[PDB]
Design a protein around this ligand. Structure first.
Ligand SMILES: *[C@@H]1O[C@H](CO)[C@@H](O[C@@H]2O[C@H](CO)[C@@H](O)[C@H](O)[C@H]2NC(C)=O)[C@H](O)[C@H]1NC(C)=O
Ligand SMILES: *[C@@H]1O[C@H](CO)[C@@H](O[C@@H]2O[C@H](CO)[C@@H](O)[C@H](O)[C@H]2NC(C)=O)[C@H](O)[C@H]1NC(C)=O
Ligand SMILES: *[C@@H]1O[C@H](CO)[C@@H](O[C@@H]2O[C@H](CO)[C@@H](O)[C@H](O)[C@H]2NC(C)=O)[C@H](O)[C@H]1NC(C)=O
Ligand SMILES: CCCCn1nccc1C(=O)O
Ligand SMILES: [Fe+3]
Ligand SMILES: [Zn+2]
Ligand SMILES: [Zn+2]
Lengths: 6, 335
């Protein structure tokens, strides 16, 4: 729970 | 002014987009990618402007900085004097559907059964039922729970893709786009209708829209509502009329997302486009209908009445709701 997946 | 570049997921959505583009006098143009996540990446790169997304995909897109712009509004259950564009959205009911003839089957006897999901990462199809299953089992091994499944977007060689059927040629087994026979709401309901699976994770509207002559599609045209049942979390089974008391969750409506600096323009253009091509639009059904696709829910759900304005300029977490966000985040700890 924090960052973009890409 | 600038053109709006829509992103189509797969070739069926591309064809529909291309018709829209022509009818719109190139006010809307089309990019296409093979999956939703790839379209999200095109938008993050600036190579497309926007697409409409289920809430699980809004989670992905919103972690990456895209924002909600307008939401699908289906017909309200109650009279409202408000214009569709200003009516608050209601959310849809995620449900677990089985055949009535499959008499033993309840929520508490799903293990080792065959399941049909809309796609990995989607609300009703995946986040809500697998989030509940991981919690009740105390196990992250959601990939070993059902004996076999069709869960578009999973590893095509794994049990989670074993019931998927691909396109007219078996090409593209398990891809998360409409070329997979069992993709999406209508695909996963077909997987149950055909007895490929024991249970389908869809929404309440899918069952009504594809039974009792509401769909003339070949696989659906002869299905009867009474031949299906909903699984309630207390272990009971109910007729599909009882969805308001036998659902897994209430989901946030699918919605259009964009980059923040394009959201205002995307919003103005969609509001004009639906005035031309929306339900009762100036030029629908005459020329083109943005919210029809012969039941296949291409670009938008076919049951969309309008795209509605959002209250409170919400962030993605405000649109999804804190409960849902927290459920997704809990589940994504498993992977
Ligand atoms: C394509 O987009 C343009 C621009 O928004 C539309 O042209 C405008 O039409 C509106 C409404 O009829 C008028 O307010 C303006 O005179 C036009 N604006 C500009 C900047 O030219 C056009 O109608 C859209 N066409 C389609 C088919 O969507
Ligand atoms: C389950 O979904 C169906 C289909 O969307 C809902 O039934 C429709 O409700 C509208 C609005 O009330 C009616 O005017 C339509 O005619 C209904 N469609 C069909 C095909 O019957 C139903 O209300 C939903 N159930 C719950 C509890 O939300
Ligand atoms: C699965 O269980 C987790 C862990 O209990 C649930 O997360 C909780 O959700 C409630 C309601 O929103 C919050 O008050 C808690 O703080 C959350 N707990 C934690 C540790 O994050 C999650 O909602 C459950 N998943 C589903 C689909 O119901
Ligand atoms: C209506 C379904 C509930 C989900 N939800 N919670 C807060 C806001 C919303 C919605 O905006 O989509
Ligand atoms: Fe959905
Ligand atoms: Zn409820
Ligand atoms: Zn806010």
């Amino acid at each position: 729970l924090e960052a973009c997946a890409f | 002014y600038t053109r709006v570049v829509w992103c189509a997921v797969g070739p069926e959505e591309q064809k529909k987009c291309q018709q829209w583009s022509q009818q719109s006098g190139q006010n809307v143009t089309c990019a296409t990618a093979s999956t939703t996540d790839d379209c999200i990446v095109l938008v993050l790169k600036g190579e497309a402007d926007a697409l409409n997304l289920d809430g699980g995909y809004i989670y992905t897109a919103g972690k990456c900085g895209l924002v909600p712009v307008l939401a699908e509004n289906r017909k309200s259950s109650k009279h409202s004097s408000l214009d569709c564009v200003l009516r608050p959205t209601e959310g849809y009911l995620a449900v677990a559907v089985v055949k009535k003839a499959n008499e033993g089957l309840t929520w508490n006897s799903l293990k080792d059964k065959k399941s049909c999901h809309t796609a990995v990462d989607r609300t009703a199809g995946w986040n809500i039922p697998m989030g509940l299953i991981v919690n009740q089992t105390g196990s992250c091994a959601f990939d070993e729970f059902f004996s076999q499944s069709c869960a578009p977007g999973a590893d095509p060689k794994s049990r989670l893709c074993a019931l998927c059927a691909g396109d007219d040629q078996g090409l593209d087994k398990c891809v998360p786009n409409s070329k997979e026979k069992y993709y999406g709401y209508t695909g996963a309901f077909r997987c149950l209708a055909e007895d490929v699976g024991d249970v389908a994770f869809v929404k309440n509207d899918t069952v009504w829209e594809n039974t009792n002559g509401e769909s003339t599609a070949d696989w659906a045209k002869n299905l009867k509502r009474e031949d299906f049942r909903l699984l309630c979390l207390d272990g009971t089974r109910k007729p599909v009329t009882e969805a308001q008391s036998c659902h897994l969750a209430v989901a946030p409506n699918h919605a259009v997302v964009s980059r923040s600096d394009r959201a205002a323009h995307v919003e103005q253009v969609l509001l004009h486009q639906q005035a031309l091509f929306g339900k009762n639009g100036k030029n629908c059904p005459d020329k083109f209908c943005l919210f029809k696709s012969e039941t296949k829910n291409l670009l938008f759900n076919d049951n969309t009445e309008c795209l509605a304005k959002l209250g409170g300029r919400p962030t993605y977490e405000e649109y999804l709701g804190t409960e849902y966000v927290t459920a997704i985040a809990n589940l994504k700890k498993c992977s």
